[PDB]
Design a protein around this ligand. Sequence first.
Ligand SMILES: [Cl-]
Ligand SMILES: [Cl-]
Length: 162
Amino acid sequence: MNIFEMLRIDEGLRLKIYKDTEGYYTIGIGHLLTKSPSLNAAKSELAKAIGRNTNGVITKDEAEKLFNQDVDAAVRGILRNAKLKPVYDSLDAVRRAALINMVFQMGETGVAGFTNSLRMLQQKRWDEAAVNLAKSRWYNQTPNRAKRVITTFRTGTWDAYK
Ligand SMILES: [Cl-]
Ligand SMILES: [Cl-]
């Protein structure tokens, strides 16, 4: 298992514009298009993302390409953020994947907001950090995904995904 297969399990793949859990227009493997309510603002963003007129639908290849870019952005965002980088540096390979996942879903800003949990992860206090991470809107709104990520941080293995 690796970050790509992990995110593919969590986000799934859809080839036609859909609404995410928050109700925002998305496509492919969790690629957010706009927080705007307009399906048209959605289609325009999509065409700009793909480089072509698409009318709401993309191919598998186009989806995976947006996916590669988004994972790359996720990592670069962490490496550039003063709060996230030290945490990431401090973790093993599996747990690193778990932080990437959170960033992919909620953005650098959001994750950066979990100050206490981040301090706990840096300190390697696994159980305490798992407990703190669960007291969040994140855990409340997407509990099954949140549990999977959390378990990854607690254990440092891929078991929740196997
Ligand atoms: Cl893009
Ligand atoms: Cl969920």
